[PDB]
Amino acid sequence: DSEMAVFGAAAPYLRKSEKERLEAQTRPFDLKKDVFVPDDKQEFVKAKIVSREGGKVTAETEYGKTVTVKEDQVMQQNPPKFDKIEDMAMLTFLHEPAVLYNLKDRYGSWMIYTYSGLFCVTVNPYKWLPVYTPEVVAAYRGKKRSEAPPHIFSISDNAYQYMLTDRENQSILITGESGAGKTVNTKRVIQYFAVILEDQIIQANPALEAFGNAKTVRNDNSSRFGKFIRIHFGATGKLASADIETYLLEKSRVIFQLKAERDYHIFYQILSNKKPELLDMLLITNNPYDYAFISQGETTVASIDDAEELMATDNAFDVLGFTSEEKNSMYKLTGAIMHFGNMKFKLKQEQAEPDGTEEADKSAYLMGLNSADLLKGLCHPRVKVYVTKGQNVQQVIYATGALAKAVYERMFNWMVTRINATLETKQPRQYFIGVLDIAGFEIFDFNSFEQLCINFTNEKLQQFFNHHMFVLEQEEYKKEGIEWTFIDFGMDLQACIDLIEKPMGIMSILEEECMFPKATDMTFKAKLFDNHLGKSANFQKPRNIKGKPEAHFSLIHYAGIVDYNIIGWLQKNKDPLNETVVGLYQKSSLKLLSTLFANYAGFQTVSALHRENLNKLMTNLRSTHPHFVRCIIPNETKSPGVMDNPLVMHQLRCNGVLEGIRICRKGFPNRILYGDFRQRYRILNPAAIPEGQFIDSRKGAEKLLSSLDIDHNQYKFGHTKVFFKAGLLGLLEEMRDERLSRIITRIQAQSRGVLARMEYKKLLERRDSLLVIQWNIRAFMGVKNWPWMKLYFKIKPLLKSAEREKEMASMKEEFTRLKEALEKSEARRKELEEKMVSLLQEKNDLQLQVQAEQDNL
Amino acid sequence: KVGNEYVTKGQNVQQVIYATGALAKAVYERMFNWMVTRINATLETKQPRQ
Ligand SMILES: Nc1ncnc2c1ncn2[C@@H]1O[C@H](COP(=O)(O)OP(=O)(O)O)[C@@H](O)[C@H]1O
Ligand SMILES: [Mg+2]
């Protein structure tokens, strides 16, 4: 249990226990006696095998109920060896009940992360589990998904491994219904990147979170804008400058909030009174109920304490390096917006007469200008012929709301730009990894233009997933000359997108009527009905319900039918403003309001910008190698552990995960280039593909594979990329690692051999020296025991041998010293000779240089 | 590389074939110049005096 010991706390929550699988193998089972049968309230139920009368197999459900049904919707249960399987591609039987029941089995053990073929699926646990510890992140470093339990950390690690190996961009895309957990997983991915500037990226997400998210019926932490976070890396394979891009912040939230929907987080974080200094300098109490814009929602969430969120976002701002002046500026603007919300107006003979201007004075003080000028601009708007115009009392409130939402949007863009500036670093950055977290699909009780935009973004993301996973993979199979029948998996959302995105479509008619002045909801809607009602499968008449608000029409996304009541979408897409107040805000005292807002009058519909951003984003994405994560919400009640079968079945059908797993298990998932394969797996059979003795790719790769003694029917050789059947690539990697280990061990053995060889040669020389010494000392003792030898042999060398024998020693040593001196002198003379040759070389070079200056003149 | 970002450029067949030709020209010119430098180094022996 090496993985268990390494993981520690998160081990039981990520990997099945050894005893658990041991008892699972002992669970009673058979090829027969096991089936899944459909049911109404629960989609599928386990059942036994009783009798097949006329082909009508009889099944006794686990609840005890017994019913006979024909061979249709009769699917064999998978063997218990596949219970709580980490990757769901090795299922011998694949069928709609099987995916649900394996997912539920893993969910019961709180195993949210599961691999469905190539991409990953995450079920919402609705409870923060101890799996995101930095120890687990370190354990998830440099590990394949096969050798590690499923987790988003493993997904990020595999993306980084591709990043390093193939030197190509990666894009981790999170897709699912709202509140499924996309933002949490994006935060975990950013955390994994930070662990392996890091504090800057960590705290940047809460900074935008505090201003973007709001509490909704579907989820309390509901993002109102798409996020694309790009982390750049250099050639060395280390983190570098980052970037964050936002998509279509829902500006209508400030003006209006639904009955069960709260407002933005910051408007109540500041009013939580955690820092009364904020209350003092903003001239605002801690009760949002006195303030019209932010009092429509509950302003209270059971799981959210706005004081903690406020201190967290302040800490994040400090970590990012936000100066106190700009923080105070945005705080003053946030105060000013509900100060504007406090505005009241009355008709008196025609422009509304201002009243209750004290709050207007306070707001003007916060932003910085003459309050009378702003009041007159709101009271008597002047626009391009600056000409005054009579307008209704109700219109001044709408104008103030539009100005407030525009100011909030500009402040949001300023935060985005400041985050980019803080994160940007001049250090080299080679490639990038893009994490995509769009606003998830959602079905509110009443839906409007922003809901339509969010759902259209979700539709386009699902269509991109379908196109890449199904169409492009099959076209790649075809192009490389691989025999493969074309299979249609049954989802092509291009028609649904073209219903609105393409010209003359519902969204296109929306921009066309927005350009058209005097545009009314009644007529424009008519322009929709005669255009696509009936003839378009998705669009249809509104399936109006008495409980739900009246809807103009109903249209079918990939996730189901949704009603879309249009109420003044033309003004929302057009975004009109009063030019007088525009001019007043342009020259405001505050740095933020003056710089940001000056480009409004310094048009293009926001829907057109949304479409262009989606097109550009997905064209950029197509250049990358996506990793998909699909998030499933188990229960609408936010109850952890409740695994509501019909909802998950509907989500699985809309997502089309089953067909993705089918195309992963049937087709060839792994495709590797011939040259890359040769240079990578040559260690398996180095004899094949001899080192630099020929030039050919296909033949060498074919010989290498044919020498690998595996199932040769798995791979179909192509023109440029050899394909691999599912599970083959990991096997080849396993034998490659084993062969590398064998090579390293043999290298160690050879190194030990040579070290022993040299040390034993040294031992030989030492033994020869010892023999010489011992023989000489033996002779010396033999001559020393002789009384004669010492007398004439100890004084002769000093005296008698000095004059005519030791003088040979003296002349020899002086010859040696003189020879050393002569050799050193001759070597010095030779090096001086070559040095003076070099001096000639450089002097003629310098005369050439002199000629060069005479050329210069 | 534009700025600090390595942006991949998309070119048609004409540009890529012209690039191949330019690479061939440049590498052969460097070939010729390296040959000239090599022969100059071999011939430029000691005592290039006077
Ligand atoms: N992996 C997870 N661990 C713990 N809670 C999670 C996880 N994923 C989602 N949740 C919870 O689910 C809810 C919605 O998750 P969130 O990421 O905010 O969704 P969305 O991306 O749709 O805004 C929150 O209550 C969040 O805490
Ligand atoms: Mg979210």
UniProtKB/Swiss-Prot annotation, chain B:
Family the UniProt entry places it in: Belongs to the TRAFAC class myosin-kinesin ATPase superfamily. Myosin family.
More about this protein: The cardiac alpha isoform is a 'fast' ATPase myosin, while the beta isoform is a 'slow' ATPase.
Span of the entire protein shown here: 405 to 454 of 1935
Lineage of producing organism: Eukaryota, Metazoa, Chordata, Craniata, Vertebrata
Protein name, entry field: Myosin-7
Name of the gene encoding the protein in the UniProt record: MYH7
Function (record text): Myosins are actin-based motor molecules with ATPase activity essential for muscle contraction. Forms regular bipolar thick filaments that, together with actin thin filaments, constitute the fundamental contractile unit of skeletal and cardiac muscle.
Annotated disease: Cardiomyopathy, familial hypertrophic, 1: A hereditary heart disorder characterized by ventricular hypertrophy, which is usually asymmetric and often involves the interventricular septum. The symptoms include dyspnea, syncope, collapse, palpitations, and chest pain. They can be readily provoked by exercise. The disorder has inter- and intrafamilial variability ranging from benign to malignant forms with high risk of cardiac failure and sudden cardiac death.
Free-text note regarding domains: The rodlike tail sequence is highly repetitive, showing cycles of a 28-residue repeat pattern composed of 4 heptapeptides, characteristic for alpha-helical coiled coils. Limited proteolysis of myosin heavy chain produces 1 light meromyosin (LMM) and 1 heavy meromyosin (HMM). HMM can be further cleaved into 2 globular subfragments (S1) and 1 rod-shaped subfragment (S2).
Localization annotation: Cytoplasm, Myofibril; Cytoplasm, Myofibril, Sarcomere
Organism of derivation: Homo sapiens (Human)
Subunit structure: Muscle myosin is a hexameric protein that consists of 2 heavy chain subunits (MHC), 2 alkali light chain subunits (MLC) and 2 regulatory light chain subunits (MLC-2). Interacts with ECPAS. Interacts (via C-terminus) with LRRC39.
Organism superkingdom: Eukaryota
